Amino acid sequence: TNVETVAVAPTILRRGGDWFASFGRERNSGTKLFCISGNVNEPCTVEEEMSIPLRELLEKHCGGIKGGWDNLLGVIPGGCSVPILPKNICEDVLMDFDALKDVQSGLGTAAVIVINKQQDVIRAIQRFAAFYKHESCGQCTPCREGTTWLLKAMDRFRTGQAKEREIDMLYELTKDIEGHTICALGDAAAWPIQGLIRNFRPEMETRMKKFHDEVGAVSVGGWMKDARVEKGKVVGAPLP
Amino acid sequence: VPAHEIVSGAPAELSRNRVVRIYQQAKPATQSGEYGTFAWRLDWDIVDVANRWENDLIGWQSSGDYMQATQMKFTSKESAIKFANKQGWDFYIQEPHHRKFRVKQYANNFVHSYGKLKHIRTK
Amino acid sequence: KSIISYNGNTIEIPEEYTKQAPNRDSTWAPAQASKTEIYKNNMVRFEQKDLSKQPMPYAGIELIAQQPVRFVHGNTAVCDGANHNGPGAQGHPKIFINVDAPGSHACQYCGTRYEKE
Amino acid sequence: LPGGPVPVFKKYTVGSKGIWEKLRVLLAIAPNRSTGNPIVPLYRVPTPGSRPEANVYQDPSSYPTNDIAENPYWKRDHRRAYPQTAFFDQKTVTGLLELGSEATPRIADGEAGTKALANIANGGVSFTQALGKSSKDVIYGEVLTVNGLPPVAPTLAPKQWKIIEGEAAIYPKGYPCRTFH
Amino acid sequence: AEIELTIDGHKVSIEAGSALIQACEKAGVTVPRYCYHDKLAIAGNCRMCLVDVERAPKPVASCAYPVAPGMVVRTDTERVKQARENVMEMMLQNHPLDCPVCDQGGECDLQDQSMRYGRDRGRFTEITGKRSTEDKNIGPLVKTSMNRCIHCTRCVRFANDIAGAPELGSSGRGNDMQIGTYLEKNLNTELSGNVIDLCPVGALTNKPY
Ligand SMILES: Cc1cc2nc3c(=O)[nH]c(=O)nc-3n(C[C@H](O)[C@H](O)[C@H](O)COP(=O)(O)O)c2cc1C
Ligand code: SF4
Numbered sequence: 001t002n003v004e005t006v007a008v009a010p011t012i013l014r015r016g017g018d019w020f021a022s023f024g025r026e027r028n029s030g031t032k033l034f035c036i037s038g039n040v041n042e043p044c045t046v047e048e049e050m051s052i053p054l055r056e057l058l059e060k061h062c063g064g065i066k067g068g069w070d071n072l073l074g075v076i077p078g079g080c081s082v083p084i085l086p087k088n089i090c091e092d093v094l095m096d097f098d099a100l101k102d103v104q105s106g107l108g109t110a111a112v113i114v115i116n117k118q119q120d121v122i123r124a125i126q127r128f129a130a131f132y133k134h135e136s137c138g139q140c141t142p143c144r145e146g147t148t149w150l151l152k153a154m155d156r157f158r159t160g161q162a163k164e165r166e167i168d169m170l171y172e173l174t175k176d177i178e179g180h181t182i183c184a185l186g187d188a189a190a191w192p193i194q195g196l197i198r199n200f201r202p203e204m205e206t207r208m209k210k211f212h213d214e215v216g217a218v219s220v221g222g223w224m225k226d227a228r229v230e231k232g233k234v235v236g237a238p239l240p
Numbered sequence: 241v242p243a244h245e246i247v248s249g250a251p252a253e254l255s256r257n258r259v260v261r262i263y264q265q266a267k268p269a270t271q272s273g274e275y276g277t278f279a280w281r282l283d284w285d286i287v288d289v290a291n292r293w294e295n296d297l298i299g300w301q302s303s304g305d306y307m308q309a310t311q312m313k314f315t316s317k318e319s320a321i322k323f324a325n326k327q328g329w330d331f332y333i334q335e336p337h338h339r340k341f342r343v344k345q346y347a348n349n350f351v352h353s354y355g356k357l358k359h360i361r362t363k
Numbered sequence: 364k365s366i367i368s369y370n371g372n373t374i375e376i377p378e379e380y381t382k383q384a385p386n387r388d389s390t391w392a393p394a395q396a397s398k399t400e401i402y403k404n405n406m407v408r409f410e411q412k413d414l415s416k417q418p419m420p421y422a423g424i425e426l427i428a429q430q431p432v433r434f435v436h437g438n439t440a441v442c443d444g445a446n447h448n449g450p451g452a453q454g455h456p457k458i459f460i461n462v463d464a465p466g467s468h469a470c471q472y473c474g475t476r477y478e479k480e
Numbered sequence: 481l482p483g484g485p486v487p488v489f490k491k492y493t494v495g496s497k498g499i500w501e502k503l504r505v506l507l508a509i510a511p512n513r514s515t516g517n518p519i520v521p522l523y524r525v526p527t528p529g530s531r532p533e534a535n536v537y538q539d540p541s542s543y544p545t546n547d548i549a550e551n552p553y554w555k556r557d558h559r560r561a562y563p564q565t566a567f568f569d570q571k572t573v574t575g576l577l578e579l580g581s582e583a584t585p586r587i588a589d590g591e592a593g594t595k596a597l598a599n600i601a602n603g604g605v606s607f608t609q610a611l612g613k614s615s616k617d618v619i620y621g622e623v624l625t626v627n628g629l630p631p632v633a634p635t636l637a638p639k640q641w642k643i644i645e646g647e648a649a650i651y652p653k654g655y656p657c658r659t660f661h
Numbered sequence: 662a663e664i665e666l667t668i669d670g671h672k673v674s675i676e677a678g679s680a681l682i683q684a685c686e687k688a689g690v691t692v693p694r695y696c697y698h699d700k701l702a703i704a705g706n707c708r709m710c711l712v713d714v715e716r717a718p719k720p721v722a723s724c725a726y727p728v729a730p731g732m733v734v735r736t737d738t739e740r741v742k743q744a745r746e747n748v749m750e751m752m753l754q755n756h757p758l759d760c761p762v763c764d765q766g767g768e769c770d771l772q773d774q775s776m777r778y779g780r781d782r783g784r785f786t787e788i789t790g791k792r793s794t795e796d797k798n799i800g801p802l803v804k805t806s807m808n809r810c811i812h813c814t815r816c817v818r819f820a821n822d823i824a825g826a827p828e829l830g831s832s833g834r835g836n837d838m839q840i841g842t843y844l845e846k847n848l849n850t851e852l853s854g855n856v857i858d859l860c861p862v863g864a865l866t867n868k869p870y
């Protein structure tokens with residue numbers, strides 16, 4: 001068990017169980033350390049009650065968002081391993097287990113990494129997929145062979161060498177890793193890609209059409225048709 | 241047992257000199273499949289002069305034995321025996337060998353060492 | 364070139380015909396059957412015959428050794444062995460060679476050696 | 481008359497030119513007849529090893545099969561979805577006559593219906609005994625047609641013929657062969 | 662002393678505490694696999710023997726899920742066929758195009774299970790492509806070509822347990838895991854030509870043959 005949940009143990013043994021149970025909701029009860037980071041004006045870590053609205057988390061104790069409330073592109077409650085909340089519904093949201101898993105997402109450890117609008121989300125999620133490829137232990141075949149393919153598709157989608165169906169395909173191969181592994185690193189690596197495809201699909205297709213008439217058109221797998229294999233290397237493509 | 245070897249058209253040489261073998265095919269050590277290990281094969285023992293020799297010319301495997309490529313499949317062991325002595329053939333029969341059932345647990349891999357460890361698992 | 368004809372007879376062939384090919388004299392397999400072996404075995408039927416119009420088609424083990432070694436800067440070297448003037452899929456299947464050990468690693472379909480630099 | 485006689489300048493055959501064609505329309509049986517020899521600049525140019533269409537060719541495909549992401553193969557496999565031969569002995573037909581059918585279950589007493597199944601599975605009843613035991617409207621319902629007639633030997637797609645006899649026929653009247661369509 | 666359960670409608674009795682794969686082998690039900698073997702320990706690496714089990718949210722690995730009473734097991738679920746195609750496509754992404762030069766042509770477990778359970782086509786067509794593994798000289802008896810390894814741990818489990826030669830192992834993380842002696846150390850044991858019938862792919866194979 002975690003370092004926090006036994007560091008809280010003598011306090012709640014002393015104060016009693018129902019003084020702890022007063023805070024939060026019916027099954028979501030008590031306190032939590034919140035570490036709010038990313039693109040806040042004031043990054044800091046709080047100790048605050050569960051079941052709390054995210055707007056009066058980010059504005060009450062964090063200064064505000066860098067650029068105000070309309071400068072919110074998205075938000076990650078918890079660590080790397082839960083999907084994005086887009087801006088539309090994360091005004092209404094509570095930070096317990098209940099009001100995040102009905103928003104298809106997790107509390108996790110309640111790290112809150114908010115996303116600047118002037119920053120790119122697909123660069124961030126390419127970085128997340130590179131984290132999961134580096135940190136995978138490599139034992140079972142779907143996680144180990146999946147994180148490498150997730151990285152190879154996310155670099156390609158970051159610059160944009162793709163067809164508009166391959167995002168579709170990307171969803172499919174996160175569904176492949178999702179529940180077939182030993183530990184939960186496989187569905188940890190599945191989830192941020194799923195949140196990206198659910199919440200920022202036109203964000204990806206804008207970058208893809210930007211590629212499509214800055215450069216010529218592209219086949220499946222990132223191949224262009226001047227792209228050929230000469231001695232050693234691959235030429236013709238800028239190889240993401 | 242009716243003797244059909246005189247009405248088959250086969251020569252007398254085959255029923256009086258050639259010994260044949262009924263066997264169930266072994267599970268290969270190569271792969272984990274077991275599909276070719278159910279039918280009973282009928283197969284002729286080789287003749288030592290007539291089996292195979294290499295050609296003068298190119299080195300083709302030449303043969304004078306003609307039952308070397310024939311092989312039969314039967315559903316049953318008693319099917320193969322009934323057909324084999326119905327045709328009047330000298331046969332040997334080979335009994336199959338299945339695997340001994342041993343109980344496996346995944347929790348066997350990490351049980352507690354009281355004395356010397358005497359092993360280090362890997363996984 | 365005189366070879367003994369199983370009887371103490373020595374039969375005589377020109378030495379341009381005891382070579383495996385006009386590239387290489389010696390044999391490139393442990394069961395390749397030397398030309399002295401072949402001619403020792405059946406010269407009953409190379410009689411009255413021209414050795415000139417026999418095929419002699421140019422052993423490839425030394426035609427691959429005189430090709431230069433390609434140099435790759437990355438970790439893995441890609442190979443298909445295709446031409447790129449031909450409209451279609453020619454060459455072998457595309458395989459990826461690791462170049463990490465000292466020396467040159469050859470393609471197992473084509474034999475073109477690749478080296479990391 | 482949609483496939484009737486066409487003149488010989490729509491037939492792709494070398495024919496004739498000059499006043500020799502004016503001679504051969506008088507010296508002919510039917511003037512709209514080719515000579516047999518194909519037109520050299522038209523027939524097989526360019527030669528098949530020299531085609532501009534060969535360098536643009538790509539392998540064809542249908543959409544719900546070449547589709548990269550949504551189909552799995554087990555949904556569009558049909559070699560492993562073969563049906564087997566429904567082999568029926570006489571005692572399963574006795575079972576179908578006496579116990580019933582899955583459309584038509586004449587079985588109450590499910591606990592006792594298993595042992596009512598059992599003796600026919602052992603061979604308690606025989607088949608002509610089942611034909612005598614069974615009702616007349618089960619004989620006219622499941623064995624026979626609902627009108628009491630024998631069922632006719634079934635065909636998959638019936639073919640109704642229509643003899644063409646006018647001048648749309650292939651031989652005019654007087655020839656001993658007819659068009660049947 | 663025994664437990665009765667149901668696989669595919671079949672009712673089967675097996676000794677208590679066994680593996681679900683042993684229940685499936687007893688009932689005649691064919692379940693595909695890559696890192697299970699009768700004379701070896703149980704590992705859940707290859708993820709091929711996933712199976713539909715009532716009172717379980719996810720498909721469970723049939724080689725390490727123990728036998729319990731009242732068990733209802735299905736193998737012909739649409740979810741199970743989808744899972745087998747998924748795990749097969751995952752296996753095939755980094756496995757090199759060596760079938761005309763591999764020694765296990767008509768004897769490859771991966772290959773015969775790829776027809777029966779795997780996907781028709783392949784979507785692996787990146788420019789960056791498959792990884793490549795360095796060849797590892799083990800000894801004079803075992804030819805070793807480790808691009809076509811699937812990391813089934815089976816050689817490592819064997820030379821650990823039975824041969825008593827602990828020189829084999831798995832060194833690395835992610836795709837940079839390798840199966841060999843880390844120092845380029847020669848492998849002795851009195852039965853070292855037995856690891857080459859054991860590997861399901863042709864990565865460890867026969868050197869004079
Ligand atoms: C890849 C992976 C990494 C994990 N890392 C941590 C961690 O760093 N700290 C932690 O407290 N739990 C971590 N967990 C969850 C642990 O399994 C955790 O110890 C356990 O599931 C729950 O312990 P608890 O009862 O305190 O919640 C991780 C899980 C996975 C699958
Ligand atoms: S999911 Fe975890 S245990 Fe399985 S291969 Fe990935 S890192 Fe290893």
Ligand code: SF4
Pocket residue numbers: 756757758759760761763764765766769770771772809861862863864
């Ligand atoms: S082991 Fe792999 S490369 Fe070799 S034949 Fe089998 S599938 Fe092909």
Ligand code: SF4
Pocket residue numbers: 809810811812813814815816817840859860861862864865
């Ligand atoms: S060396 Fe062979 S048996 Fe061992 S893990 Fe690799 S592929 Fe499997």
Ligand code: FES
Pocket residue numbers: 694695696697704705706707708709710722723724725
């Ligand atoms: S054999 Fe059961 S998962 Fe590898």
Ligand SMILES: [Zn+2]
Pocket residue numbers: 442443444455470471472473474475
């Ligand atoms: Zn090559």
